[PDB]
Design a protein around this ligand. Structure first.
Ligand code: AGS
Length: 290
């Protein structure tokens, strides 16, 4: 990880600590409910690295990928999953990081991926790149993203991106993200697999009930419920008396099987976030843009 610069080492270091990672890994197993998207990704990005000269007049015209969908449905997880298959250096970039002159980060980001051999750039929440003197910050940055993105054999740089609000992306920005993919909320079989992933070290119609009680919850919400519920059992009972002394390390009493009541209490905390009216918009966007 050694590079020449004409930049502020402050900016260069921020990037190194926050954006760049190589060891961070995500197996495809660990992502549930996306069997079709995984195929699409693997074709657009992974396979083209395994057989480059094989792609000629079927070369994947896709330069970058846009994944579309509501919050917390596995989009970042998929992006990480590619970088671990391909053993590339992973750049997890927010669009907030880009905004905070402010352009130079974008030019640096790509200039760092270029040197860092095979890279994968993932630009989260790229809706926000667009939309008086403050909005001028965003127009100069969008300008530099579109110039850099055209810069896309093991010197390969991949450009994945993600948005909750796809309808806020103009034609100029569409040309750069040729492949589009819908990452919906988990299906009934999808939501049940997600629970198998999260509850695997803890404590079916039980979990199908739970899965069937979700119905419009994102993968992130379901994971939290498990976190909460998993934690709920022992609190109210085992240390409900709150004896500071007594709660010493008495790990003999470790088995505290988490109940159904817990998952029903956990469910009450957060109510469904994404309306069927919101999903209408996603359904429509991939209609014409996929
Ligand atoms: N299909 C899934 N399989 C496993 N975990 C999931 C899944 N979907 C969501 N999650 C949870 O929520 C995160 C999924 O990544 P995503 O949140 O979709 O990426 P994102 O939607 O761009 O992220 P945000 O919105 O910036 S927090 C993980 O940390 C998981 O705990």
């Amino acid at each position: 990880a050694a590079d020449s610069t004409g930049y502020d080492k402050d900016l260069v270091e921020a990037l190194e600590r926050d954006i760049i990672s190589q060891n961070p890994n995500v197996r495809w197993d660990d992502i549930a409910d996306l069997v079709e998207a995984k195929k699409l990704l693997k074709e657009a990005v992974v396979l083209p690295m395994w057989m480059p000269e094989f792609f000629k007049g079927i070369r994947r015209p896709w330069k970058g990928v846009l994944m579309v969908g509501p919050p917390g449905t596995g989009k970042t997880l998929l992006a990480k999953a590619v970088a671990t298959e391909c053993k590339t250096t992973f750049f997890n970039v927010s669009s907030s990081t880009l905004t905070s002159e402010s352009e130079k980060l974008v030019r640096l980001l790509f200039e760092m991926a270029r040197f860092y051999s095979p890279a994968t750039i993932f630009i989260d929440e790229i809706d926000s790149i667009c939309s008086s003197e403050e909005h001028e910050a965003s127009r100069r940055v969008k300008a530099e993203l579109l110039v850099q993105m055209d810069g896309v054999p093991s010197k390969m740089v991949m450009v994945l991106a993600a948005t909750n609000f796809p309808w806020d992306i103009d034609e100029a920005l569409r040309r750069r993200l040729e492949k589009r993919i819908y990452i919906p909320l988990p299906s009934a079989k999808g939501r049940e697999e997600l629970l198998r992933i999260s509850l695997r070290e803890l404590e079916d119609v039980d979990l199908a009930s739970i899965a069937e009680n979700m119905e419009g919850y994102s993968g992130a919400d379901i994971t939290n419920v498990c976190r909460d519920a998993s934690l709920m059992a022992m609190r109210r009972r085992i240390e409900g008396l709150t004896p500071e002394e007594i709660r010493n390390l008495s790990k003999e009493e470790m088995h505290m099987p988490t109940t159904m009541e817990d998952f029903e209490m956990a469910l009450k905390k957060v109510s469904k976030s994404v309306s069927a009216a919101d999903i209408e918009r996603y359904e429509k966007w991939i209609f014409e843009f996929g």
